[PDB]
Design a protein around this ligand. Structure first.
Ligand SMILES: [Mg+2]
Lengths: 64, 138, 228, 153, 120, 137
RNA sequence: CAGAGUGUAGCUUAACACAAAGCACCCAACUUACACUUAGGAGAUUUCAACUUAACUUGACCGCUCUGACCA
């Protein structure tokens, strides 16, 4: 299962403290990660540039 | 003619591997200000950590036993089917032992912690990559 | 030829959607590993930013302190609601839905009528000359209730095989029985449509496989079906 | 001595595979795959490294030759989320992507389904498993580019 | 004055001794032997023995290796064996198990170094 | 002119067709363990054991002592297994072993040793000292 | 259900007794990883009797595999 190789720690001799952070993906699924600051959740945003030009013409008003 | 001679000699420079950031320690870490106080541990705590790691050795061993048994069960089941298929239809068996051509690339994603929320609108933004560029120079 | 009908079966599996819940010992080992990580870890940028605030208190320009930032961060997390790991299907025990038992791996079981009897089996289709045995298994997916399911067949070798013999009335020199060869596949995307969801299909885990399958049939299905 | 029955009692080089003191390509037979690359990409460096170690040790248990185990250059991405009631994107967080590659050769045709099942089921959360057949393009991806060479082209 | 088997310079271990201490560590047990250069075993202590095994929590840890040394040292003195050579590998010598086992032998009266042969 | 070997040659079972697939030693200790075992075995070729090893009668040494005592292995194994489980149960025993403070009572060891392996260790010592060779031929 | 063989933990024609052994395994540290090495971890005679003894020979007992029957 997922727990087969999940439980671990940073194996570097010198490393800065990392805090567990829930990364919320665009679909809304969340995965635990290690982040520099003691945040509780991180949300990955939808990138506007990827949007096609036909949609952006009509999504310009929708974005508002 | 001069251009051709140069092209032949260009390959003498061997390729150089791209450094890996993960292995390279950051310089900021060297500073002794960014050092944990290194608090010592109590006697009772060392017992709890030692006994816990003893339990971990055996729990992991049982985990490996199930994985080893699972592969053994699958291998025997697959072999028996291959033996039966050969007897029943040798021509069909020959196809079954061939290597799958369209199998790869095989891409799989780890299971998330929570399932995706149906109605979730992520606040739009932009992804900017800071990856450096390393070019080999004679 | 032979009195054995060659049939190909499909072992369609839905791989875990969510990570499994850590067990008691794993819950302890996880905390110990986190504790050990902190002890051997150098001070983080946020940690140092907080030490400066402590020095300021002893003596007596960022208005927001390190602790103040953490308070704001916590508020946002509490507001956000995570997707339920245990779905509404688990409450209703609706075994016809791909939503239930996200952590576990489900298998597809279809009810077909054989000898005027309702028997749960893996989707199967009779072999047609000129097609590989795995080709038959792929055909089983198409020859089902209306569905958009897409599957990734892993390899061409049969995972397992179950042999049964027809009853005396059906049993004859021409048709004694059938040879069923199973083929594993992963359900990448898609599900049975609402029109085809009336019944005769149940997504079940390995533990629940015995409830629907026969004794001898179950014994062979379990071998290749992964417990993990 | 040559004549004596014990001639050759101390020959050992046949026992050891000869090694010669740019790299030949390897492909597979109709019943075996060629060199394969197992790409373990995960935002958490520990999880990527952890599963790379697990896959390597699993290959040893199955007597599967592991040609090489290494890492790819870390990928850093800046997540600039729109500031409230503002038209200018502001940096919110930096996310690194860490990739570990385990190279295996000689994987059997029949056994491939068994191997993929085991390493697919044990995948940790947030870790992406991509298995690709080895190719010269991949090996050149770990070596720096030569603009000067391209300029001469 | 007895001659030691000199030679064997290109191979390991040396044969230039009258008695040697050999420690055999298995997956489950620890064994220490004192044997003559001719291959005969003079005295031995092993965790397989019930006399030693019943007083040990584990028969494969450092404590077992130290206990074997203490027991073997007593049996050595009773057999009149005061000197022997110990021929470990680089990793065996560094290990704490062999350090503790050697200390027990020396604290038990065994020198672990043999006197030089008297040629004249 | 070549002479056929007078027996199985060393390193002949090793299949050279699949050299890469064979399991290597990987460690000095594993090779040495196998090397010592091979040396002990008898060989058709000339060996150091022949010229330097003592020549003794092949017939087994006559045993002129008292008969061995009768022991019930099933009961003996039962009690010993229960004794070790009792010893290992104690938390103090595990802690002493983990912290490397535990020791064995030398006096108690020798008392049990005399009852169990001591007669066979004294026989080995007497054999090494030549007492049997000189006292009972 | 019936017949047949079969039984030490994963393997072993390990087990004379002085003893359930050797190796294969699992964790931690080292190693990018592997390997090596160090320091740790888990353990079996299916069960009960049969003349002292019996992991071993006898019977039952239980498990195991194989074959045939039942068997859509
Ligand atoms: Mg390891």
């Amino acid at each position: 299962d997922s727990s087969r190789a999940s439980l671990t720690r940073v194996h570097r001799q010198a490393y800065a403290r990392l805090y567990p952070v829930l990364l919320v993906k665009q679909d809304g699924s969340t995965i635990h990660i290690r982040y520099r600051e003691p945040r509780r959740m991180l949300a990955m945003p939808i990138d506007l540039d990827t949007l096609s030009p036909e949609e952006r013409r009509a999504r310009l008003r929708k974005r508002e | 003619e001069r251009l051709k001679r140069k092209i032949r000699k260009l390959e003498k420079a061997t390729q150089e591997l791209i450094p890996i950031e993960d292995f390279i320690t950051p310089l900021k870490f060297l500073d002794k200000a960014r050092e944990r106080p290194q608090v010592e541990l109590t006697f009772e705590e060392t017992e709890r950590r030692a006994l816990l790691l003893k339990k971990w050795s055996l729990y992991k061993q049982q985990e490996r036993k199930m994985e080893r048994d699972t592969i053994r069960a699958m291998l025997e089941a697959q072999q028996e089917a291959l033996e039966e298929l050969q007897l029943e239809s040798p021509k069909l068996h020959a196809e079954a032992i061939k290597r799958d051509p369209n199998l790869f690339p095989f891409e799989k994603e780890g299971p998330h912690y929570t399932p995706p929320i149906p109605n979730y609108q992520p606040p739009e933004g932009r992804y900017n990559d800071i990856t450096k560029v390393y070019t080999q120079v004679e | 030829g032979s009195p054995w009908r060659l049939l190909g079966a499909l072992c369609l599996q839905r791989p875990p959607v969510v990570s499994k819940p850590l067990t008691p010992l794993q819950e302890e080992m996880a905390s110990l590993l986190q504790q050990i990580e902190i002890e051997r870890s150098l001070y983080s940028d946020h940690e140092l930013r907080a030490l400066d605030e402590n020095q300021r208190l002893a003596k007596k320009q960022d208005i927001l302190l390190a602790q103040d930032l953490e308070d704001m961060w916590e508020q946002k997390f509490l507001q956000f609601k995570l997707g339920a790991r245990i779905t509404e299907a688990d409450e209703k025990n609706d075994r016809t839905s791909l939503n239930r038992k996200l952590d576990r791996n489900l298998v597809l079981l279809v009810r077909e009528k054989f000898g005027d009897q309702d028997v749960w089996i893996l989707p199967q289709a009779e072999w047609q000359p000129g097609e590989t045995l795995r080709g038959t298994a792929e055909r089983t997916l198409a020859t089902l209730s209306e569905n958009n399911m897409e599957a990734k067949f892993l390899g061409n070798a049969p995972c397992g095989h179950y042999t049964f013999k027809f009853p005396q009335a059906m049993r004859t020199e021409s048709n004694l029985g059938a040879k069923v060869f199973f083929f594993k596949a992963l359900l990448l995307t898609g599900d049975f449509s609402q029109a085809g969801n009336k019944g005769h299909h149940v997504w079940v885990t390995k533990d629940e496989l015995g409830d629907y399958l026969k004794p001898k049939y179950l014994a062979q299905v379990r071998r290749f079906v992964s417990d993990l | 001595y040559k004549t004596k029955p014990t001639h050759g009692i101390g020959k050992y080089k046949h026992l050891i595979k000869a090694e010669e003191p740019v790299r030949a390509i390897n492909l597979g037979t109709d019943y075996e795959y060629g060199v394969l690359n197992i790409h373990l990409t995960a935002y958490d460096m520990t999880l990527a490294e952890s599963y790379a170690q697990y896959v390597h040790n699993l290959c040893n248990s199955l007597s599967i030759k592991v040609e090489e185990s290494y890492a790819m250059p870390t990928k850093t991405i800046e997540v600039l989320q729109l500031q409230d009631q503002g038209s200018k994107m502001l940096l919110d967080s930096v996310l690194t992507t860490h990739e570990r590659v385990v190279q295996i050769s000689g994987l059997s045709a029949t056994f491939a389904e068994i191997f993929l099942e085991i390493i697919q089921s044990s995948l940790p959360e947030g870790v992406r498993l991509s298995v690709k057949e080895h190719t010269e393009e991949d090996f050149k991806g770990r070596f720096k580019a030569r603009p000067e060479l391209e300029e001469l082209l | 004055v007895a001659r030691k088997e000199r030679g064997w310079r290109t191979v390991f271990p040396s044969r230039e001794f009258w008695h040697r201490l050999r420690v055999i560590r298995t997956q489950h047990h620890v064994e220490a032997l004192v044997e003559h250069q001719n291959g005969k075993v003079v005295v031995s202590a092993s965790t397989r023995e019930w006399a030693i095994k019943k007083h040990l929590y584990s028969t494969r840890n450092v404590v077992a290796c130290e206990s074997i040394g203490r027991v073997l040292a007593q049996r050595c003195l009773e057999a009149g064996i005061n000197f022997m050579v110990y021929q470990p590998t680089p990793w065996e010598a560094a290990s704490d198990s062999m350090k503790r086992l050697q200390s027990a032998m020396t604290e038990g009266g065994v020198v672990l170094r043999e006197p030089q042969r008297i040629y004249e | 002119r070549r002479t056929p070997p007078l027996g199985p040659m060393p390193n002949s079972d090793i299949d050279l067709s699949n050299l890469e697939r064979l399991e290597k030693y990987r460690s000095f200790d594993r090779y040495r363990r196998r090397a010592e075992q091979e040396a002990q075995a008898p060989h058709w070729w000339r060996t150091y054991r022949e010229y330097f090893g003592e020549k003794t009668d092949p017939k087994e040494k006559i045993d002129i002592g008292l008969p061995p005592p009768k022991v019930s292995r099933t009961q003996q194994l039962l009690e010993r297994k229960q004794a070790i489980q009792e010893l290992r149960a104690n938390v103090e025993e595990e802690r002493a072993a983990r912290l490397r403070t535990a020791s064995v009572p030398l006096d108690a060891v020798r008392a049990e040793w005399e009852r169990t392996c001591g007669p066979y260790h004294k026989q080995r010592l007497a054999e090494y000292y030549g007492l049997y060779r000189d006292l009972f031929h």
